[PDB]
Amino acid sequence: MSLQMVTVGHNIALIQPGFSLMNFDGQVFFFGQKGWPKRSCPTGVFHFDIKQNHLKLKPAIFSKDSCYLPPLRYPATCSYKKHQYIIHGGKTPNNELSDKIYIMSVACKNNVTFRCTEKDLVGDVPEPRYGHSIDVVYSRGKSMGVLFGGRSYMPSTQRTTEKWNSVADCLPHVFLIDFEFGCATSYILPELQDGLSFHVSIARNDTVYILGGHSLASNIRPANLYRIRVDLPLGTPAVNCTVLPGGISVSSAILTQTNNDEFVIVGGYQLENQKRMVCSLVSLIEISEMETPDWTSDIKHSKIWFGSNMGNGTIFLGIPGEAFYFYTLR
Amino acid sequence: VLLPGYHPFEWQPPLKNVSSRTDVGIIDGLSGLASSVDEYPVDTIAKRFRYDSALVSALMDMEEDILEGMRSQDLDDYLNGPFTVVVKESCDGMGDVSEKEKAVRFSFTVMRITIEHGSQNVKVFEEPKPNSELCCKPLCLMLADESDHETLTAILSPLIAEREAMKSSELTLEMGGIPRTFKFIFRGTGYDEKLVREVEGLEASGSVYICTLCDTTRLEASQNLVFHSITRSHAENLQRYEVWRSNPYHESVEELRDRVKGVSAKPFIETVPSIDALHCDIGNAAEFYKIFQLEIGEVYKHPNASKEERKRWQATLDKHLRKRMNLKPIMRMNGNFARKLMTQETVDAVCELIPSEERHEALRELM
Numbered sequence A: 001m002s003l004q005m006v007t008v009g010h011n012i013a014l015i016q017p018g019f020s021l022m023n024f025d026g027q028v029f030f031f032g033q034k035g036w037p038k039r040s041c042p043t044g045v046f047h048f049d050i051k052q053n054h055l056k057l058k059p060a061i062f063s064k065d066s067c068y069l070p071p072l073r074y075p076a077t078c079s080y081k082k083h084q085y086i087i088h089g090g091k092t093p094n095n096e097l098s099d100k101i102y103i104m105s106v107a108c109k110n111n112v113t114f115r116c117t118e119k120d121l122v123g124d125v126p127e128p129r130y131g132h133s134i135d136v137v138y139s140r141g142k143s144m145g146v147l148f149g150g151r152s153y154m155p156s157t158q159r160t161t162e163k164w165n166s167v168a169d170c171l172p173h174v175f176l177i178d179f180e181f182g183c184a185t186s187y188i189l190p191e192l193q194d195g196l197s198f199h200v201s202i203a204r205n206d207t208v209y210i211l212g213g214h215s216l217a218s219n220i221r222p223a224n225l226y227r228i229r230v231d232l233p234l235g236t237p238a239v240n241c242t243v244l245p246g247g248i249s250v251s252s253a254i255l256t257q258t259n260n261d262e263f264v265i266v267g268g269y270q271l272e273n274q275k276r277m278v279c280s281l282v283s284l285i286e287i288s289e290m291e292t293p294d295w296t297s298d299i300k301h302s303k304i305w306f307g308s309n310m311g312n313g314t315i316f317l318g319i320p321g322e323a324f325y326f327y328t329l330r
Numbered sequence B: 001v002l003l004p005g006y007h008p009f010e011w012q013p014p015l016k017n018v019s020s021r022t023d024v025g026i027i028d029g030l031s032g033l034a035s036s037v038d039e040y041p042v043d044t045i046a047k048r049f050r051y052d053s054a055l056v057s058a059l060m061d062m063e064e065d066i067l068e069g070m071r072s073q074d075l076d077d078y079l080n081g082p083f084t085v086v087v088k089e090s091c092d093g094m095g096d097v098s099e100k101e102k103a104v105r106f107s108f109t110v111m112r113i114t115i116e117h118g119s120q121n122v123k124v125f126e127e128p129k130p131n132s133e134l135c136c137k138p139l140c141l142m143l144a145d146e147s148d149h150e151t152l153t154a155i156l157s158p159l160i161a162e163r164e165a166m167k168s169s170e171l172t173l174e175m176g177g178i179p180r181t182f183k184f185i186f187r188g189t190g191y192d193e194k195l196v197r198e199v200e201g202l203e204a205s206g207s208v209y210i211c212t213l214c215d216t217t218r219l220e221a222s223q224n225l226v227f228h229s230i231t232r233s234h235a236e237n238l239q240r241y242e243v244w245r246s247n248p249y250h251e252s253v254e255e256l257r258d259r260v261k262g263v264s265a266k267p268f269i270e271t272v273p274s275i276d277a278l279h280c281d282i283g284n285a286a287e288f289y290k291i292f293q294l295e296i297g298e299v300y301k302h303p304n305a306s307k308e309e310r311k312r313w314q315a316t317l318d319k320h321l322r323k324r325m326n327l328k329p330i331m332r333m334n335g336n337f338a339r340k341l342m343t344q345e346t347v348d349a350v351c352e353l354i355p356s357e358e359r360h361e362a363l364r365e366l367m
């Protein structure tokens, strides 16, 4: 794991905490710019190209049948195999939380045009949230989406302007989501007692592992790991969750894929005053510490850091400053 | 006594989503914004009043003027009929505050108070100096950039909720021993163009949709000078944002932008966008100055000119105005220049440089 500084083009200001990076056919794209889209880039989605440690953001265009989604901070994102991306939740530039679901796919590639289609949700729709996890599970030749955790504002009932922006953890219900038709089912589990946000999620077959996170009510980053198994029979699917010992305690960690059935996670925040400098390796599950990479002094003494997974087993990181300072850790 | 939170009041019905406590003074402007390291970084500090509590304190501050205005209109001091308060909302960035950091100031001005006595609305109070800092009452001070949309919306949305809820009620408050009733009309007019375009989801000032009041384009408004109506309104803008975001007729981005007329972001403050006396004189002066330059070179007779010929015309006009009018030439437009240039005497002066007197007639009539 070798760390490398990155310079950025004229529009470096676009990059903000809670942004997202997505990988389509090796090509990386960027979503969640700061502020509302400008006449230079109406979509707010950018070809994210790093050449010779220099980052250029180039505007991407949407297709004619596309929705023009607002840029979203801390959405729940996952990959679906045509190859596409699922975006649910998140914060808008106006500080509003979205409960809608958007689907991103490559519509045309000329020397890329995107299709962004919003999927309506009926049934047990999840309350609008940010900082939650969403993944796709496959059980008996059927595909189903699993969504857990996060935060939102107080309900319209108890919301008072004096604490207008006050947030709380969602109810720790698991949400199964059928993407073709837009239907949503909510499951209460006995093993999931507390709310959880900013956690890490790993999806293999009919299973999703939930790691770390931050529980706002207790203000603890619990050191627990949850396995969630999903069965998709002809009838209502069945969900079982089990507590697993050996869980790391980390919020806002980033996850990347180094090889099939093996993931590495670079740090997040370990305490309010502490940072997680160490790195972990997960094999599909066993969690083993790895050698900490060569952090520079600036990263070590920064109180805040943020980042996203580029896809090619390489993390793109940022520290506060110049506006922000960026690194690539491979 | 003079600060918010001292006098008691009531809202009938109670304000929606607003606490009813009346002992509330200065409260945190972030309005409970999450500050965990996980969350979005908070680089600002802010303090505000609760909007209604502030209006209460303001009315109690001006009680003496209200009572004496009722007397001055031949009315009874103890009358308690429904007073109507027209309130101006203003927001501006205060530029750099650093001592060696920008600030935003959210404020309200009491513009006038009328009473209903018969089928008449009797003006018992009106602000004499509406553009003085003495009566622009502070409501929210934040250390943040008016261009930082995320922090701006997070800090201001609570205030907009309180105002929207005050739109649906009557405030009862005890003045001079007699309980009185007040209805409020909120008019957001203290927004300069940039802040209006920001908070009403319009594009930046370089756009083709130049007017914040109408759908015209720079090209259209230059071809059709006069005939346009005020057509924008907060609701229309909200709708057009939803149109942009859903793109329901599956258009290209150019066609979509044409449809929603430059509303490409979701509004979050209902404003009354206007103009000020200054900019009228200014626009007119810029056009007249360019007309003077082009009347000296006889462009009405010669269509083509090099840049050198135009700079020599402007230099000629600048030298002549310095000589005969004692107006210094300016390299960038400004208010009092417009004020001093838009006179008939300067038309005479510039006519001293134009050969043809038919164009002397043209310029004299235009001015």
Ligand SMILES: [Mn+2]
Binding pocket: B092, B093, B192, B194
């Ligand atoms: Mn300004």
Ligand SMILES: [Zn+2]
Binding pocket: B211, B212, B213, B214, B215, B216, B228
């Ligand atoms: Zn207009």
